[PDB]
Amino acid sequence: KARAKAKTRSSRAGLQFPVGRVHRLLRKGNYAERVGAGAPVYLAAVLEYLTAEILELAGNAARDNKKTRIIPRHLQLAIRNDEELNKLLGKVTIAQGGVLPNIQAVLLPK
Amino acid sequence: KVSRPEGVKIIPPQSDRQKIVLQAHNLAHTGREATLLKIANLYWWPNMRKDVVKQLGRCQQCLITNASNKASGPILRPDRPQKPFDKFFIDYIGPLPPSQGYLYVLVVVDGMTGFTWLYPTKAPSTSATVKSLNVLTSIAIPKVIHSDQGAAFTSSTFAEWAKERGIHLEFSTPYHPQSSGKVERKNSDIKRLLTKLLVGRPTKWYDLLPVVQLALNNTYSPVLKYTPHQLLFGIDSNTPFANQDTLDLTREEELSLLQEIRTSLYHPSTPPASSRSWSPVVGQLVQERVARPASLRPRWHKPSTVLKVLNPRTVVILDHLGNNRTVSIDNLKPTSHQ
Amino acid sequence: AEWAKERGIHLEFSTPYHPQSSGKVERKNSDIKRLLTKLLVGRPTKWYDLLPVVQLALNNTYSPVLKYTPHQLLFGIDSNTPFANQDTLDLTREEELSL
Amino acid sequence: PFDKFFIDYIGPLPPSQGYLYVLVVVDGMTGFTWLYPTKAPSTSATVKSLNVLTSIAIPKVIHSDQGAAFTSSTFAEWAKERGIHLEVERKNSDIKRLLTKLLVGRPTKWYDLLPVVQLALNNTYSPVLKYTPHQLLFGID
Amino acid sequence: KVLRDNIQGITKPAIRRLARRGGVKRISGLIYEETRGVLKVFLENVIRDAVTYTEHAKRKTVTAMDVVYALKRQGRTLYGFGG
Amino acid sequence: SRKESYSVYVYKVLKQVHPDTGISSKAMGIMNSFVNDIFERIAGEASRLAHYNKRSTITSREIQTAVRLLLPGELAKHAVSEGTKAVTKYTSSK
DNA sequence: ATTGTCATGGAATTTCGC
DNA sequence: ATTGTCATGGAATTTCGC
DNA sequence: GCGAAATTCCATGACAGTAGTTAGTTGGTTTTCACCACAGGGAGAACCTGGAC
DNA sequence: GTCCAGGTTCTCCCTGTGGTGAAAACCAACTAA
Ligand SMILES: [Mg+2]
């Protein structure tokens, strides 16, 4: 026999990051023994807010330097432009980025 | 306009028939009578109730929530088989409290007698059932095995073992535990024997399972007056309080006495069919019950048409999914106001 | 109970593990979950919106074996509702109290 | 009964838990008194107090004086969604004299005694009508 | 309960005595308005991480292992009180 | 064989707030490995929250506390309220 | 020192037309 | 292409004694 | 007196706390492989700006 | 102010990367207890 229409749990919460894949990365990562049904929902949302907030800021730096695609320099520069995004990734190197443009305003020429 | 002995009432136009009732129906989503008394405050016209029934057949927000007030009819008592090893009624019990790493107990009741068989396992998988019956198919081979539509029995693997033995698998109608008859009774026996033994101690019930298929299998059926041993074998084994009344006979001739013992047994009584019974009709609209109804959800699905009627208790309906889901008539409801 | 003695509330409790003792509330909870069930078909169950509806939709359902509103048996006359009686407007309110 | 609601604020009081003006309802023939406090005197804070009233009582005609929330635009957008045509006497004098002098005199303790003020008004005898409003409302004698 | 002017409770010698444990001979008079600032940054990143543990178990008392768990989080482990 | 990833679920977020924007391959892997790292910080602090309160159960309450620890300041105000929308929408369904 | 219930659709019943 | 059941104690019933 | 219409009757079922968990299967989602229409850069030059003076 | 150096912008051609379309694979969700 057949069964009902399989509605994915990512579409039942209005998210884009999956909840089926997150819920088997809380029971095969030995984080705890029981994982609630609402926990990979709530975690796939916080993975989805923070994935926007970089790419929101990574979209602007691509636009301000006339680019269609976002190369890692923009991800390097979207981070450390925002203050609170930088304090999350304060220890973290991003590959192929270089640094922000910075002079200490004492080395200016005389 | 019209005059009534309770006041002045209003005759609406013929174009205003469906609109005036539908706005009174959806005020509280009532059925036939509380709908009608709303219209009995402003309006009145000949054949009010032919229009209220015209509403509710289209109002598919009210067909899938109200339940039937029409019970199903008389229950069927199917006959006993004429030999043992013809119908086994199997159903896991448990999760019980644990002992020796066991939680689930397969219970194989013979449909001839009541002779239970126990085969405890760790988890109700397919393969835990298959080795549990290879002990029991060592005794003899059944024709038919009844069950419920279990998680382990409906597997495509379990049926491929069952076709080897000559097992005719039989499954109950879904969400109908009343179909599996004797096994739901002996599970109220096993949990009234193991309950009585285990009073005042830790439930170490894996010790007491060789007791149960020897203590229940020598309980006299108090309305048949025989052991399960005698109706299965013919004479008692070396048990306490065993009959010597058969030792005055020849075993070479009481085999055919035993076939006349088996055909004189008590048959149960069908209850009288109550007044608000209802019968399925091929072509009548019926509604199944939603399987596991979530909170604040329809209890019933959308209407469906009966394809075939098998007995007056088992009917094949055509679900919204396109499903030939062979349900009982303790599942269905008569679709209101056809 | 210490709040209940302030009001003059005589608390009454059912016999334990006997939900059949509380009579009507176990019936109207099968009404509220057959009104809020019927409204919320095919949408997310945002039932906190629909609670002012329920104590105005059930409280004007005619008891089909008593033939009255809950409003009339509580107050005496309908409020401004759709399909309200005018059969009581042929009477005096100063005398239909004892009616 | 359920004929016409003469509905008026009272205030501005000393606030208790952020409530300023008290919505007082005067019934059409009986004179029953609902007391729903409002946060602000706006149209937004009275309709949400009137929505609890609409589940119990709906008047035939809503009729009072000229204000900001009792004469508004969205107030009539909601009222015509219901279907109410826009447009006891001693209970009006309690708005100007009694209940203003009852809800002033307690610093924050007027919010606590709102049912205590309410239940005494409905059991008050009316010599003109020869009943109390609670008895006229519910039809018990 | 509110008791203010207690970032000024870290007195002028008690910052000098902490300076002497670091091996510092001569100090300025403008460290005192710098130390009280860097101290309250460090206690607004521990108490903010400690209270979310105590609220999570619905306790009303921020216990001894709570602070150690907060200091476990930042990468500055404190022995001697458990955890 | 199969490498699971979060690369597809970036285009379903990149095309939400910047619909005329592509993204390179070597910048995908950063937002890929941003996810897997910020996954196991939140999980691996919710995990150690299970032992600290003697429960074997990761609830959706424990992920909320393991986001109010890792995210500082103003991200901890939004990503909490950007989860409790996606749960209340989820639980009113099904 | 407390107790079912009550909306609801065949189906039987009564009205009543002339 | 399926369907209650059956142990169990008042209580009614039958045996039957002489 | 027959038929149709308004009404009353009555037996029934569901509400009770409801969340889960497991086992087996299926449908849809996802990862991957092959692909081309393209975006950005590389190159040259024309235009440009400020620091060298 | 002045001249020039190294840069920045604009355009044209070319390539590599990406975004996608199609099958396979596997997991997630549903079903019955
Ligand atoms: Mg079962």
Which tokens belong to A57? 């800021």
Instruction: Read off the amino acid at residue A27.
Output: R
From the CB of residue B84, how many other CB atoms can be counted at a distance below 10 Å?
19
Contact A88 F70 (CB under 8 A): yes
Separation CA F34–CA E17 (nearest Å): 44
DSSP assignment of B12-38, as one string? --STTHHHHHHHHHTTTT--SSHHHHH
Q: Which residue is nearest to nucleotide I29 (CA to C1')?
A: A8
Q: Distance, angstroms, CA A110 to C1' J2?
A: 20
CB proximity B288–strand J (7 Å threshold): no
Rounded to a whole number of angstroms, the distance between the first and last alpha carbons of chain C is 38
Provide, in whole angstroms, the distance separating residue A70's CA from nucleotide I39's C1'. 12
CA–CA separation, B180 vs B311, rounded Å? 16
- Residue B310 has phi, psi (to 5 degrees) of -95, -50
Q: How far apart are CA D121 and CA D137, in angstroms?
A: 13
Whole-angstrom Cα distance, residue E50 to residue E38?
Answer: 19
DSSP string, E26-49: ---SSSHHHHHHHHHHHHTTTHHH
* Residues linked to residue B314 through DSSP beta bridges, in sequence order: B311, B328
Quick check: F65 and E53 CB within 8 A?
yes
The terminus-to-terminus CA distance of chain F in angstroms comes to: 34
Distance CA B209, CA B105 (A): 10
CA nearest to C85, candidates A53, B143, D2 = D2
D5 three-state secondary structure: strand
Q: Return d(Cα D51, Cα D71) in angstroms, integer.
A: 17
> Which residues, in sequence order, are CB contacts of A26 under 8 Å at separation 6+?
A32, A35, A39, A40, A43, F43, F58
Q: Which CATH code for domain B220-265? A: 6.10.20.110
Coarse DSSP helix, strand, coil percentages of chain C, rounded to the nearest 5 percent = 35, 0, 65
- Give whole-number Cα distances, C92 to B41, C87, C96, D136, D140, in Å: 18, 11, 6, 12, 16
Residues of A in contact with B323 (CB under 8 A): 1-2
For residues B226 and B223, give the distance between their C-alpha atoms in angstroms, rounded to a whole number: 9
Three-class DSSP category at A80:
coil
What is the Cα–Cα distance from B154 to B156, expressed in whole angstroms? Answer: 6
Neighbours of B (≥3 Cβ pairs closer than 8 A)?
A, C
In contact, B284 and B338? CB cutoff 8 Å: yes
Inter-CA distances, C27 with B32, C12, C22, E75, Å:
19, 18, 9, 59
Task: Tell me: is residue D3 an annotated ligand-binding position.
Answer: yes
Please name every residue paired with F23 in a beta bridge, in sequence order, or none if there are none.
Answer: A70
Fold of B1-67: Endonuclease III; domain 1 (1.10.340)
Write the burial class of residue D75 (CB in 10 Å: 0-12 exposed, 13-18 middle, 19+ buried): buried
| Cβ within 8 Å of residue B291, ≥6 positions away | B174, B175
Q: Which residues is D62 bridged to in the sheet?
A: D5, D86
Q: Which chain E residues are within 8 Å of F52, Cβ to Cβ?
A: 53, 57, 65, 69
For F13, the token pair is 């977020």
CB contact at 8 A, D2 and D60: yes
Q: Which residues contact B24 (CB under 8 A, 6 or more apart)?
A: B35, B38, B39, C82, C83
The number of distinct structural domains making up chain A is: 1
Q: How many CA atoms are closer than 13 Å to the CA of A43, on its beta-carbon side?
A: 33
Q: Is B65:B89 a contact under the CB 8 Å cutoff?
A: no
H helix and E strand count, chain E = 4, 0
For E71, phi and psi rounded to 5 degrees? -70, -25
Chains E and B touch (3+ CB pairs under 8 A): no
List, in sequence order, every residue forming a beta bridge with B328; answer none if it has no partner.
B314
Closest-CA residue of chain A to F46: A31
**How many CA atoms within 13 Å lie on the side-chain side of B330?**
12
Rounded CA-CA distance D43/D76 in Å is 10
Tokens representing A24? 């088997």
Question: Of all helices (H) and strands (E), which one includes residue B325?
Answer: none
From the alpha carbon of C58, which nucleotide's C1' atom is closest? G7
Is the CB atom of residue B289 positioned under 7 angstroms from any atom of strand J?
no
| Method of structure determination | cryo-EM
Distance of A59 CA from J13 C1′ (whole Å): 28
Specify the amino acid at residue D55.
S
In chain E the first and final C-alpha atoms are separated, in Å, by 29
Rounded CA separation C40/C50 (Å): 9
- Measure Cα distances from D76 to C50, D48, D81, E19, F41 in Å: 22, 14, 8, 72, 54
> Tokens 């602090």 belong to which residue?
F45
- Residue C52 amino acid letter: P
CA-nearest of E81, F72, F69 to E67 is E81
- State the distance from the centre of ligand 1 to the C-alpha of B115, rounded, in angstroms: 19
Q: Where are the alpha helices (DSSP H) in chain D?
A: 43-54, 74-82, 89-93, 99-102, 114-122, 133-138
The Cα of B323 is separated from the nearest Cα of chain A by a number of Å equal to: 7
Torsion of CA D34, D37, D43, D49, to 10 degrees: -60
Q: Which residue is nearest to nucleotide H7 (CA to C1')?
A: B222
Helix (H, G, I), strand (E, B), or coil: what is residue B120? Answer: strand
Q: Does F30 touch chain A (CB under 8 A)?
A: yes
Distances (CA, A) of D60 to B91, B188, D35, D67, F44: 65, 63, 20, 20, 63
Token pair recorded at residue B180: 């599996």
HSE-up (13 A, CA, CB side) for residue C59 = 21
Phi and psi at residue C83, to the nearest 5°: 60, 55
Q: Which residues contact B88 (CB under 8 A, 6 or more apart)?
A: B108, B109, B110, B111, B142, B144, B145, B146
Residue whose entry in the numeric block shows the structure tokens 């013929």: B14
How many angstroms away from the CA of A50 is the closest CA of chain F?
Answer: 8
CA F21, CA A65: separation in Å to the nearest integer? 13
Helix (H, G, I), strand (E, B) or coil at F85: helix
Which nucleotides on chain I have any atom < 7 A from a protein Cβ? 5-7, 9-32, 38-41, 51-52
- List the B272 CA – J21 C1' distance (angstroms): 67
Take residue F64 and report the two structure tokens written for it.
Answer: 């909320």
Single-letter amino acid code for the residue at C50: L
Q: Is residue B324 less than 8 Å (CB to CB) from chain A? A: yes
What is the amino acid identity at position A92?
V
Task: Give the number of other CB atoms < 10 A from CB of residue D31.
Answer: 25
Domain C62-99, architecture per CATH: Helix non-globular (6.10)
Domain interval for residue A5 = 1-110
Separation of alpha carbons B143 and B127, rounded Å: 21
Pairing type for strands B333-334 and B104-110 reads unpaired
Tell me the CATH number for domain D1-141.
Answer: 3.30.420.10
| DSSP, residue by residue, B154-183 | SSHHHHHHHHHHT-EEE-PPTT-TTSSTTH
- Count the residues in chain C: 99
| B79 annotated ligand-binding residue | no
Could you give the CA distance from residue A6 to residue A20 in angstroms, rounded to a whole number?
Answer: 13
Domain of residue E78, residue span = 1-83
Q: What are the C-alpha distances in Å from D61 to residues B81, D1, D27, D55, D82?
A: 77, 11, 11, 16, 11
Check if the beta carbon of residue B306 is closer than 8 Å to that of residue B331: no
Resolution in Å equals 3.9
Residue D132 to residue D120: CA distance in whole angstroms: 10
Neighbouring-strand partners of residue C51: none
D to C contact (≥3 Cβ pairs closer than 8 Å): yes
What is the third-level CATH fold of B68-75+274-335?
SH3 type barrels. (2.30.30)
Tokens of B126: 């397919």
By Cβ distance, the residue of C53, C74, C80 closest to D2 is C80
Cα gap D123→D132, rounded to integer Å: 5
Enclosing H/E stretch for C71: helix C70-74
How many other C-beta atoms lie within 10 A of the C-beta of residue B182?
22
- What value, to the nearest 5°, has the Cα angle with vertex B251 and ends B248 and B256? 110
- For tokens 């300041």, the residue is F73
Q: How many domains does chain E have?
A: 1
Q: Which subunits count as partners of chain E given 3+ CB pairs below 8 Å?
A: F
B86-219: what CATH class?
Answer: alpha beta
Neighbours of B323 (CB within 10 A): 16
C-alpha torsion E31→E33→E38→E41, nearest 10? 180
Angle at E78 between CA E76 and CA E83, to 5 degrees: 115
Q: How far apart are CA F16 and CA F23, in angstroms?
A: 13
**What residues contact D35, with CB distance under 8 A and at least 6 apart?**
D22, D23, D24, D25, D114, D115, D117, D118
Task: Please report, for the domain that includes residue A8, its CATH number.
Answer: 1.10.20.10
Contact yes or no for C83/B41 (Cβ under 8 A): yes
Domain that holds residue F3: 1-94
CA of C4 to the centre of ligand 1 (A): 48
Q: Alpha carbon F89 to chain centroid distance?
A: 17
Are the CB atoms for E64 and E82 separated by under 8 Å? yes
